[PDB]
Design a protein around this ligand. Structure first.
Ligand SMILES: Nc1nc2ncc(COP(=O)(O)OP(=O)(O)O)nc2c(=O)[nH]1
Ligand SMILES: Nc1nc2ncc(COP(=O)(O)OP(=O)(O)O)nc2c(=O)[nH]1
Lengths: 266, 266
């Protein structure tokens, strides 16, 4: 079904054997430090290691959940430590070109842009240069949709044209519906319900619903009681053709993904 | 979508608002007793109560996991205690006509037959008389299929004709693919993968995959580590149109069902 693999420097991800699990890295920053200090980076490394043992195929690393020069000093040491100590592709969760650049020099393999190259188009130029996969997430500054899905796909196309114009190859493009961004709770559900529509664009899709507020809205449960809700969204995502899921609870979701895969015949 | 409700005596189950959760009752029998004793029945009642609090809509009660007169002395006291103390429809997990009869006299509302009225055709006569819903599960004494799904549906039809010939009304018929019965691990997965085919028969479908061995075969995990695997099967079942799921882990599955429902628009 996918006639290429996702090339990631020293690592290679097959898109046909299994749903790939992207594990969300904890990055609790030390008050009292610029970045680089031992407690932050060690806890970050130990967590990456956990997730690798629990079935993660990618470790996703952020610098904000804030000043570009600040964000780089936080995230660079983490990428360096994790990439040396954990044999797994790292994605860098940024929408900033300079952050993406340093993150890749530091060892990051994949760019993860929640603004789909619309916040900082040069990020696509960075991606094109280092020849790395980039995730283009659906996002916008408003919820004024005429037709949710039609508009998401349009909006996603606008991200693709920016990526391609800057030289990004189709094989390095991943799409993401951006669940939990620029969407009402009911719109998030509608997108989940129609996620298979994204497949017509011809690119691998990553789904990120982990613990997000729309699960809370449905279940009336707080962030730490959302594991069954998240699992449902992962399952439905995989039945609808997603190639990756981005999740906090790697052990649990790994298992649900693995059972879904066997059922749907991936 | 369903133009009737499932009538169950004093209780009424809507088939359109939500996936209905059937909770599997613990029925650890006392060595040293015929049935009726306080420790068995109390633990059974306390468990029914738990499941009711965790989101169950039906309590399913068995007498074997053994002598018909023996099976009745175990199960009758349980039905009597649970039905008085827990305001929920009870189904009786038996393929024996006499057991089904006493269970209903004792307070049971729904018959649950893992042999789909083929082991004891008179069970359909019982069902017809008390005018109660009966679950006809797919089952057979061999795994020699020509075409798994085609044959299951055929086999299910043979159960329906027996139910109808004995006077059972369409509205009281529920079907169940019998996952984990007369099926190799790979056949169980194939059935999951094609469960929506059962919908053409026009009856509500109950799915029972809880902790079953085919999840173990996929995940290489023992019975008590199968919650994420079960959840996956429930999710995929609900996406494929199931009206009920029969589960041990009522709290967790209730939540996954509830999130699936919101996503698929039930
Ligand atoms: N590609 C992609 N990246 C993302 N980054 C952040 C969040 C949400 O961030 P937040 O809820 O602040 O924390 P966490 O990163 O733990 O989800 N969601 C996505 C997503 O769905 N897709
Ligand atoms: N309608 C229906 N009834 C059933 N009864 C027993 C079991 C399997 O029984 P077992 O694994 O012995 O124990 P448990 O009853 O806890 O599943 N599965 C079904 C099922 O899938 N559907």
């Amino acid at each position: 079904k996918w006639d290429y693999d996702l090339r990631c420097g020293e690592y290679t991800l097959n898109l046909n054997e299994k749903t790939l699990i992207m594990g969300i890295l904890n990055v609790t920053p030390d008050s009292f430090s610029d970045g680089g200090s031992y407690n932050e980076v060690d806890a970050a490394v130990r967590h990456a290691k956990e997730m690798r043992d629990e079935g993660a195929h990618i470790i996703d690393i952020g610098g904000e959940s804030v000043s570009v020069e600040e964000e780089i000093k936080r995230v660079v040491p983490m990428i360096q430590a994790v990439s040396k100590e954990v044999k797994l592709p790292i994605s860098i969760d940024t929408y900033k070109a300079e952050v993406a650049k340093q993150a890749i020099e530091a060892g990051a393999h994949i760019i993860n842009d929640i603004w789909g190259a619309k916040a900082e188009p040069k990020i696509a130029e960075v991606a094109a240069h280092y020849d790395v996969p980039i995730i283009l997430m659906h996002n916008r500054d408003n919820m004024n949709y005429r037709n949710l899905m039609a508009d998401m796909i349009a909006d996603l196309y606008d991200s693709i044209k920016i990526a391609k114009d800057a030289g990004v190859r189709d094989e390095n493009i991943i799409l993401d519906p951006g669940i939990g961004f620029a969407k009402t709770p009911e719109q998030n559900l509608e997108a989940m319900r129609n996620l298979e529509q994204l497949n017509v664009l011809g690119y691998p899709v990553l789904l990120g619903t982990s613990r997000k507020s729309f699960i809370g809205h449905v279940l009336d449960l707080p962030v730490e009681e959302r594991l069954e809700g998240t699992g449902a969204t992962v399952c439905l995502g995989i039945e609808k053709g997603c190639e990756f899921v981005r999740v906090h609870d790697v052990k649990e979701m790994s298992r649900m993904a693995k059972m879904m895969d066997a059922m749907i015949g991936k």
